[PDB]
Design a protein around this ligand. Structure first.
Ligand SMILES: NC(=O)c1ccc(OCc2cncs2)cc1
Lengths: 195, 198
């Protein structure tokens, strides 16, 4: 059940689709970016259509929706990426096994594109082109992280296997989220931009 | 969606079911185990009914069954572990981020053995304070595999000029595989827990 707004893939399972500037989808994603990165120039925005990653992600979403016995498990966040990792992420998504890991050994996502836009996360390539994903993340129920976590903490130490879904730097006002499991993050758009 | 031979879980997502000796299900696992561990005695065999793990695993199997060319992508393998790890594995499966370094490393992933005798080593199935050893019997998506290397954090590419098109798993020896390493969540379903003693 591949989303309606995806465009036909001629029976293929992976496609990157360049969005048309000035149409609704492009304008929505651009506005999420320019909220904090209005000094940056957008060269292009690509929709990531990865059927297998989507399938695996949607399964985890339906599971977290049952487990948490409410919705609102999903946030739209940013991930800066070096050019050399874009093909792997487009195909395979985010892998904790591949910077500061102060809040645990998981994959990091920023609330603000400005954070992911730092050269440390979105390293300029030969031509000064920077790369950042807009990511559907299953943040679910979250707590403050700490160094050395390999999974989120338990919600209550009396049930050590019933875990928080993610961790953050700050629970009242989060600026980053860490997830510790494959298929808790779906890379939805890739933004190619310059300083 | 859940297999029809599973006991009714009411509306529950998790259950361990104690098997009865004389049942074909118990006897096939005991025989698989005793093939290489006839020195040990089985206390009990539990069927693991974990709906969420089962769902995510079956999705990965369907994807690998589509991607690969009529391959048998699944092997039934062994995994020894310590008592302290059993409640987490039962609920959340095998986490590569928790995995011990193997005496012979073919990569940084989760290790599964062809032979129960390998998993039965005290290094993997550590005797608990009561002298009970624990070994999972695990459906593993081995898929298309190659000989691993200690540096790996993901399976290697099949083709060095196509770095994102990966082997599904790695092994110690492609001619005579005795262990498999997987590097992704939901590539292994813990199906049975064997509790055993000397
Ligand atoms: N790739 C990214 O966009 C990215 C990477 C790392 C991020 O946080 C790392 C930190 C850990 N402790 C404090 S900062 C945020 C975003």
């Amino acid at each position: 059940n591949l989303p309606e707004h995806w465009t036909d893939m001629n029976h293929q399972l992976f496609c990157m689709v360049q969005l048309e500037p000035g149409q609704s989808e492009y304008n929505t994603i651009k506005d999420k970016f320019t909220r904090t990165c209005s000094s940056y120039a957008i060269e292009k925005i690509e929709r990531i259509q990865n059927a297998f990653l989507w399938q695996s992600y949607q399964v985890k979403k339906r599971q977290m929706d049952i487990k948490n016995d409410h919705k609102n498990n999903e946030r739209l966040l940013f991930h800066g990426t070096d050019a050399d990792s874009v093909p792997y992420v487009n195909q395979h998504g985010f892998n904790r096994s591949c910077n500061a890991v102060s809040y645990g050994k998981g994959t990091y996502f920023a609330v603000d594109a400005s954070y992911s836009a730092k050269d440390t996360y979105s390293k300029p390539d030969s031509n000064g082109r920077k790369h950042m994903y807009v990511v559907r993340v299953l943040t679910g129920v979250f707590t403050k992280g700490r160094a050395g976590l390999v999974t989120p903490p338990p919600k209550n130490p009396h049930n050590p296997t019933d875990l928080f879904d993610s961790v953050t730097n700050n629970t009242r006002s989060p600026k980053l989220f860490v997830v510790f499991f494959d298929n808790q993050a779906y890379p939805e758009y890739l933004i190619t931009f310059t300083a």
